[PDB]
């Protein structure tokens, strides 16, 4: 498959900035969701899950075709709980009916991170909705009950290397697990709706204890009320992952720069951009705009 980026006809920077503003303002307004964590965490989880179905071998999956909108992908077990992020973005799509689904889903992730005080993520437009028969089959998204060699091998299908995987994983400072969605329960830290290098600091500073949870799954629990998944705990079991974890713990700006590069690569995998295409857009925050 080739997937050529096609700008939505007649739209420019100013148009996409209005869709960003709309998402950012509704993030401000619906602050009560999930005990006052707000929708920002589920929105970056949604942008990583629409993107994480990609396979570099045959160019199937990825963010381009906006296929999460179809039943098969929407009802994938690994996506339980994302229906909340979909329902949030849906009034915004009715307001701007011209934006493609993959562009809206991916832009929700960019808006969430920058409004939660994160790095600026450059974003590119151009995904085109594709038919229901291009919807990836269930089962391409990663398991939590596994080790550092599973993680390295999995992320290789999206050709992410070690540094990219560790940086990407740092988005687990946001939000929390929910027993009814994934069989795991608890947050990764205290400030779970502000983007910081906290996940790395908890991983190197907490006295973690392995316990079974109410779903019979194992997880690492700390005295502080925080949890780590087996796949998360892997990053300090592997000698190569652990030097990067330490590096991000001592330097949030290096983590912000590397997370910025890898989240954009994750959102653009599987998409060919012609060089007549617009440069990546850097969107302003509500705060930068005085709104
Ligand atoms: C091996 C990789 C990964 C695994 C096994 C994994 C697994 C999970 C699980 C089990 C949950 C909890 C879902 C729930 O109960 O609602 C979760 C949540 C979340 N994940 Fe990951 N994760 C992985 C990678 C990533 C990456 C690369 C990102 C983002 C760039 C990410 C972002 C999030 C966010 C922000 C949440 C919280 C959402 C919320 O609060 O509802 N994850 N992850």
177 CB near ligand 1 (under 6 Å): yes
Dihedral over alpha carbons 186, 187, 188, 190 (to 10 degrees): -140
Ligand 1 centroid to residue 124 C-alpha, Å: 23
Residues 154 and 137 in one domain: no
Q: Which residue has the tokens 């908890």?
A: 202
Q: Which residue has the tokens 């892997």?
A: 234
What count of other Cβ atoms lies within 10 Å of the Cβ of residue 244? 23
Residues 170 and 104 in one domain: no
Residues 289 and 226 in one domain: no
Residues 9 and 101 in one domain: yes
Q: How was this structure determined?
A: X-ray
197 closest CA partner among 261, 255, 258, 247:
255
Residues 131 and 268 in one domain: yes
3 included as an active-site residue: no
CA dist 106 and 23 (Å) reads: 12
Residues 129 and 6 in one domain: yes
Residues 60 and 94 in one domain: yes
Residues 66 and 48 in one domain: yes
161: domain CATH number is 1.10.420.10
CA dist 239 and 210 (Å) reads: 20
Residue nearest to atom 36 of ligand 1 (CA): 45
102: domain CATH number is 1.10.520.10
CA-84 nearest atom, ligand 1: 41
Residues 60 and 129 in one domain: yes
CA dist 37 and 112 (Å) reads: 12
189 CB near ligand 1 (under 6 Å): no
CA-144 nearest atom, ligand 1: 5
Residues 183 and 163 in one domain: yes
CA dist 114 and 134 (Å) reads: 31
Residues 137 and 252 in one domain: no
Contact assessment for residue 96 and residue 22, using Cβ atoms and an 8 Å cutoff: yes
Q: Could you tell me the residue range of the domain that residue 106 belongs to?
A: 1-141+263-291
Ligand 1 centroid to residue 172 C-alpha, Å: 6
Residues 133 and 270 in one domain: yes
The H or E element spanning position 177 is strand 176-177
Ligand 1 centroid to residue 117 C-alpha, Å: 19
Contact assessment for residue 188 and residue 45, using Cβ atoms and an 8 Å cutoff: no
CA dist 145 and 184 (Å) reads: 10
CA dist 64 and 51 (Å) reads: 8
Contact assessment for residue 81 and residue 178, using Cβ atoms and an 8 Å cutoff: yes
Q: Is the dihedral of CA 103, 108, 109, 111 positive or negative?
A: positive
For the record, the structure tokens of 136 come out as 């990836």
For the record, the structure tokens of 50 come out as 């629409």
Is 172 labeled as ligand-binding? yes
Q: At what angle do helices 40-51 and 83-95 cross, to 10 degrees?
A: 90
Q: Give the count of domains, the chain.
A: 2
Q: What is residue 244's three-state secondary structure? A: helix
Resolution in A: 2.1
93 included as an active-site residue: no
231 CB near ligand 1 (under 6 Å): yes
Contact assessment for residue 258 and residue 168, using Cβ atoms and an 8 Å cutoff: no
């Amino acid at each position: 498959l080739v997937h050529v980026a096609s700008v939505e006809k007649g739209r420019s920077y100013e148009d996409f900035q209005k869709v960003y503003n709309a998402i950012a303002l509704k993030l401000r307004e619906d602050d009560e969701y999930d005990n006052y964590i707000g929708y920002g965490p589920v929105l970056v989880r949604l942008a990583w899950h629409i993107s994480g179905t990609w396979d570099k071998h045959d160019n199937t999956g990825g963010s381009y075709g906006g296929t999460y909108r179809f039943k098969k992908e929407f009802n994938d077990p690994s996506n339980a709980g994302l229906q909340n992020g979909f329902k949030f973005l849906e009034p915004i799509h009715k307001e701007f009916p011209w934006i493609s689904s993959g562009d809206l889903f991916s832009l929700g992730g960019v808006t969430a991170v920058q409004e939660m005080q994160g790095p600026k993520i450059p974003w590119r437009c151009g995904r085109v909705d594709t038919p229901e028969d291009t919807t990836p089959d269930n089962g391409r998204l990663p398991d939590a009950d596994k080790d550092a060699g599973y993680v390295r091998t999995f992320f290789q299908r999206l050709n992410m290397n070690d540094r990219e995987v560790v940086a990407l994983m740092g988005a687990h400072a946001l939000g929390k697990t929910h027993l009814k969605n994934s069989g795991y329960e608890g947050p990764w830290g205290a400030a779970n709706n502000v983007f910081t290098n906290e996940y790395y600091l908890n991983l190197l500073n907490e006295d973690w204890k392995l316990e079974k949870n109410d779903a019979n799954n194992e997880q690492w629990d700390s005295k502080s009320g925080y949890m780590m998944l087996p796949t998360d705990y892997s990053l300090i079991q592997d000698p190569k992952y652990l030097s990067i974890v330490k590096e991000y713990a001592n330097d949030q700006d290096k983590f912000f720069k590397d997370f910025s590069k890898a989240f954009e690569k994750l959102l653009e995998n599987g998409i060919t951009f012609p060089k007549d295409a617009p440069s990546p857009f850097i969107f302003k925050t509500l705060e930068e705009q005085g709104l």
